[PDB]
Design a protein around this ligand. Structure first.
Ligand SMILES: CCC(=O)NCCSC(=O)[C@@H](C)[C@H]1CC[C@H]2[C@@H]3CCC4=CC(=O)C=C[C@]4(C)[C@H]3CC[C@]12C
Ligand SMILES: CCC(=O)NCCSC(=O)[C@@H](C)[C@H]1CC[C@H]2[C@@H]3CCC4=CC(=O)C=C[C@]4(C)[C@H]3CC[C@]12C
Ligand SMILES: CCC(=O)NCCSC(=O)[C@@H](C)[C@H]1CC[C@H]2[C@@H]3CCC4=CC(=O)C=C[C@]4(C)[C@H]3CC[C@]12C
Ligand code: FES
Ligand code: FES
Ligand code: FES
Ligand SMILES: [Fe+2]
Ligand SMILES: [Fe+2]
Ligand SMILES: [Fe+2]
Lengths: 366, 366, 366
C-alpha cells in the first residue's frame, strides 16, 4: 500500500529564457564583475558609453579570469597578459604584440537592459531570442512617481530552483508559513507565461497596525522560466496603495541557485521621496522574512516528482508541464506545455477551516 | 614479494537488525526529533500515551521535513501544510480539506521500547523481525538497585562501522591503546550473536588508586550486527562491583556512523544514589577517553580486507564472515556465517612480553 | 566562428621522476612524518644512523597509520599494535609475538639524499631510476661560502600542477604579474630536461633601491617533471651577486599539489653569515609575493588544452609535448617528446611596447 517518493536526478541542462542578474546601478561603475551561473563563470563589464557587455569569464588565450581583469576603453583587459576583448567578443588589442589573430573570438552573451535591471539570455541551442519572448516594461519606472528598488538577494544551496516556481500554485503555505489569509486563488498558463491571482488578508492572531479586514489584491505572472513580476494593491485610508514586487532567480548549477527580489511603490499624494522609499523597504523586508521561512522548508525538504495532492491543492503537474517547456528543445515542445490551462480553487471550506484556527488561538490569551 | 592492501568499495547496503537510536527519556518530551540514518532521514515522535513512533522524515505530499513539524494529538503535523500522519503512517487529517485520500500511506518503521532505550529495525527486504531475533532485557533495569545510564555519543566520519566490530577480536590494542593488561581472551560466534570473554588488569606504569593486581572480568556479546552489551565485574574491598556497559552504533551512510554507549552500576550496600551514579559516570568517562583514542586510529587508518595476522591475533576473518550475514539476504546466508566457532588465544608469551615492557618502563624513573 | 575552450579530464596518473619532499633538517629529528602524495599517504622516518626511509603510511596488518607511530631503533613502530618495520619494508619484530611471518613486506620507496634535501622517486611502472636520470649536485652546498636555504612552501588546491611548468615559456606574465622587464628569452628542451634563459630588469614605475638599468641574468632548468633549479646573477657594486633559486613541487592528487622553493646566496667578500642569510631571505620573500600572485591567477583560471597564441608567446605545445613524456610508459615515449627543440622570442616589439607603458605611467604623477 505505502506510497513511495520519486526523486529523479535533477536536470543537467539549464532553462531557456531571460534570467535577471541584478540592477544596472550595481554593474555601472566601470569595474568588471564575476558571476557564477549556468554551470560556468561569466564576466559582466560596462563600456565607456554605458552599455553592459557579457562574455565567458575564461580567457581563450590561457584560461585567465577576465572578471579579475580591468576595463580599458570599451574592452576587457585580462589580468594574466592584458589581452583586450570587446563587447562582441573579438580580441581588439594585444599590448605587447603588433596585431591580433582574426580567429580570436569568444562567446558574447545576448543581453537586455530594462526596468533598472540586467537580463541575460541563456539557450543551450545557442540561437538568439525571438520577437514575442521578452520582459515587459513596468508601467512607469524611471519617473519620480515611482521609487527606486528595495532590491535584495539570497543564495540557496542544496536544492533545484523548480520549487520556487511551485509556489505559484501553493495557496496553503501562505497561511501556515507566511501567516496570511487567502480568500481567492486562480491560475492561468499561456504559452511561456504562468500566472497567479490572489486576494489575501492578514490574520487577527498576530502581534504588532492593520484593519480588521485589511485586504491585499495580488496578481503575479512568470514570463518564464525564471522571471516574475507581481502587481499588488490595497485600498486603505481612502485611496489605493499600489506596489510592484519582482521575483526573479537564476541557476548557478543544478544543485544551487541565486534568488533576487525587489519592490517599488507609487508615490501617494502628499508623501515625500523618503516616506515612499521607506514603504518599499518595509515591504521588501517583510518579504525577506517570508523567503527566509521558505529556505528552511526548501533546505530540509526532499525533491519529489510524485506529489500526493488533496482537493484544495493547486495544479502542480500542469505547472511542471508548462515549466518543462524550457528544459527541452523548442522543436520538441508540445501543445500540453504551451496550452491555455486555467483553474480556480474552491476555498470556501479552506477559509472556514482557517477561521476556526484563527479564532481558537485568540481565546488562548490572556 | 611485497604484500599489497585490498580496499574494496564499502557496502551501499545497510545491515539487517536492531539499531539503538538512544534513550527513551531523550525522545519522551512531546517534540519530534530528526535523525539521519541508513542513507536517508527518519523522524521520531511520541504520541500522547507515550509510545514512540518512527517514519520517513520526508512528507509524501510535497517532501516537507516532518521532523521540523509539530506533534498534535497522536499525529505528526508537517511544517509545510500541517498534514497529520499517525503512528502507522496513515494520513489522519488535512486541516484545510474535508477528508483525506486512502492512498495517503507512508512507511512506518518497526520499533522496540526496552532497557530505557529505543531500537529501530532496518531491513532492506522490508520484512518484520522474527521471533528469536531481538534484544535481551537487562537483569533488573528500572528498579532502585541499578542506577540510570551515563549515556554518551560520538559521530564518526570518514570510515565504515565494520571496524568497531573488529575490536571484538583485537586483544592487543587494549594494551597499546587503552592501557590495560589482558590475561585471558576467548571468542564465541553463534547464529547472529558474537561474543568476547576477557579477564584484564591495570598496568603498574601509570600515574594516579588500584590494587597491584586489580583485575576486571569482562563478558561482551554483540546481538548483531550493531548492538553489544558488556557485563563487567571486579572483586575488590571484599564484595564485587558489578557493572553493565552498553556499546551500540548505527550507520548514517556507508562513509559515516554514530557511536553510542552507556553504563549502569549495581548499588553496593551502604552506598547512596549519587555515589552510585558517580561510579557510572567515572566508568563512562574512562571509556570516553578509550573510544576517543580509537577514533584517532580509525580516522587515520585505511580500510583493509586482507589483513596479515600473526599467531597472537584473534579470528578476524571468522568475525567478518559472521558479520557478512547481515548485509546479505536472509535466504543467501550460509552455515559458515551462523556456525558455532570458538577460539582462545594462548596469551602466555604475550603477557610475558608485556611484563618486560611494563617493568622496563618503571626503571626509567625517577 | 567563436573559439571554444578544451578542458580534458586531468590525468589520474602521476608523473615519473624525482619529487622533492623538503629539507633533510626537517626530517632529521627522530620522529616520523606523514605526507599525503601521489593519491595516497606516505610516511618518512630517519633511522639511528641518519638515513631517511620512506614507505606506504598504511600498515599491512590492520591499516594503521605508521606516520602516527614512533621510531624505535631503525624500525617504525605502528601506533595500533607496535609492529616494527625496517627501511627495506620487512617486518622486523612483533613485540607480543615470538617471531614474524616472512611474507610481511611493505612497499619501500626509492630515495635520494642531496643538496640538503630529500627526493622520492615515484614511477607507476615500479622500476628503479636509471643512471642518467637524477638531480644535479649544486656547485658547493654545505661549505661556508654559501648560506643555508630560505626554504618555503605553499599548498595549492583546485588545479593541476601542469601550469607551474607552463611558466617556463610565459615571458609576458613576468611583466604584468611579477612586475619585471624581460629583455631576452630563450628555451631549450633536451631529453627529460627543460630550460629557460632570461635576462630581465626592473621597471622604473615602482616605489621603494635599484639602478636605472639594474639587470638580472636568470638560467632555469627543469630536470623534469617536477624539479627546477635556477642560477641567478646581477653585476652590481663592482662584483657579481650570484644566487641559486630552487623551484620544486609534488602532486597530492590530480586536483591538488604542494609547491616548494628556496634560495641560497654566495657569501660576498666582506660580508658576514647573517647579512648573507638576510639576502637569501629577502629574495625568497620577494619570490613568495610572486607565487602568491600566480596562485590568484591559477585559482581563478580554467584549465585549457587549446591555447590561442600570438607571435610573442613562447612554445606552449612543445613544452607540453616534452612534459607528456612523464605521464606515459617509458616504452611509449616518442622522439617528439625527447627531441632537441630550441626557440628564442624576438622581444624587440614587446619591450618597445612595454617602454611606452612604463614611461606613460611615470607622467601620471605627481
Ligand atoms: C505587514 C506589511 C508587510 O510589510 N508585509 C510583507 C509583504 S506581504 C508578504 O510578504 C506575504 C504575506 C505575501 C503577499 C504577496 C505574496 C507574493 C505573491 C506573489 C508571489 C507568487 C509566488 O508564486 C511566489 C511568491 C510571491 C512573490 C508571494 C510571496 C509572499 C507574498 C509577498
Ligand atoms: C580506571 C577506572 C575506569 O574508569 N576505567 C575505565 C573503564 S575500563 C576501559 O575503558 C578499558 C580498559 C576496557 C575495559 C573493558 C573494555 C571493553 C570490553 C568490551 C568491549 C568489547 C569490544 O569488542 C570493544 C569494546 C569494548 C566495549 C571494550 C572497551 C574498552 C574497555 C571499556
Ligand atoms: C627586489 C629584489 C627582490 O627581492 N626580488 C625578488 C626576486 S626577483 C622575482 O621574484 C621575479 C622578478 C622573477 C625573477 C626570476 C624569476 C624566476 C625565473 C625562473 C623561473 C622560471 C619559471 O619557469 C618559473 C618561475 C621562475 C622560478 C621565476 C619566478 C619569478 C622570478 C623569481
Ligand atoms: S589568459 Fe587572458 S591574457 Fe592570456
Ligand atoms: S509537505 Fe507535508 S504537508 Fe505538504
Ligand atoms: S595496524 Fe600496524 S600494528 Fe596492526
Ligand atoms: Fe513562500
Ligand atoms: Fe578500542
Ligand atoms: Fe609566475
Amino acid at each position: 500500500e505505502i506510497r513511495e517518493i520519486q526523486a529523479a536526478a535533477a536536470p543537467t541542462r539549464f532553462a531557456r529564457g531571460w534570467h535577471c542578474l541584478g540592477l544596472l546601478r550595481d554593474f555601472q561603475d566601470g569595474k568588471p564583475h564575476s558571476i557564477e551561473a549556468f554551470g560556468t563563470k561569466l564576466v559582466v563589464f560596462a563600456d565607456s558609453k554605458g552599455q553592459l557587455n557579457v562574455l565567458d569569464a575564461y580567457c581563450r588565450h590561457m584560461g585567465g579570469d577576465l572578471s579579475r581583469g580591468e576595463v580599458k576603453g570599451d574592452s576587457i583587459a585580462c589580468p594574466f597578459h592584458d589581452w583586450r576583448w570587446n563587447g562582441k567578443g573579438k580580441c581588439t588589442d594585444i599590448p605587447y604584440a603588433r596585431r591580433v589573430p582574426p580567429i580570436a573570438k569568444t562567446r558574447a552573451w545576448t543581453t537586455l537592459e530594462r526596468n533598472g535591471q540586467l537580463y541575460v539570455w541563456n539557450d543551450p541551442q545557442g540561437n538568439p531570442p525571438p520577437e514575442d519572448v521578452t520582459i515587459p516594461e513596468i508601467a512607469g519606472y524611471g519617473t519620480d512617481e515611482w521609487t527606486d528598488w528595495s532590491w535584495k538577494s539570497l543564495r540557496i544551496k542544496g536544492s533545484h530552483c523548480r520549487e520556487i516556481v511551485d509556489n505559484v500554485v501553493d495557496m496553503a503555505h501562505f497561511f501556515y508559513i507566511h501567516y496570511s489569509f487567502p480568500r481567492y486563488f486562480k491560475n492561468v498558463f499561456e504559452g511561456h507565461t504562468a500566472t497567479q491571482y490572489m486576494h489575501s488578508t492578514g490574520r487577527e492572531d498576530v502581534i504588532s497596525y492593520d484593519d480588521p479586514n485589511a485586504e491585499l489584491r495580488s496578481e503575479a505572472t512568470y514570463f518564464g522560466p525564471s522571471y516574475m513580476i507581481d502587481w499588488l494593491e490595497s485600498d486603505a485610508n481612502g485611496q489605493t496603495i499600489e506596489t510592484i514586487l519582482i521575483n526573479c532567480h537564476y541557476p548557478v548549477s543544478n544543485n544551487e541557485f541565486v534568488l533576487q527580489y525587489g519592490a517599488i511603490v507609487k508615490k501617494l499624494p502628499g508623501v515625500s521621496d523618503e516616506i515612499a522609499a521607506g514603504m518599499a523597504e518595509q515591504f521588501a523586508e517583510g518579504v525577506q522574512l517570508g523567503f527566509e521561512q521558505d529556505v528552511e522548508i526548501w533546505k530540509n525538504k526532499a525533491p519529489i516528482d510524485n506529489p500526493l495532492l488533496s482537493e484544495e491543492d493547486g495544479p502542480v503537474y500542469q505547472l511542471r508541464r508548462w515549466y518543462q517547456q524550457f528544459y527541452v528543445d523548442v522543436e520538441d515542445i508540445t501543445e500540453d506545455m504551451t496550452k491555455r490551462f486555467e483553474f480556480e480553487i474552491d476555498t470556501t471550506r479552506a477559509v472556514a477551516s482557517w477561521q476556526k484556527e484563527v479564532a481558537e488561538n485568540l481565546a488562548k490569551q490572556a
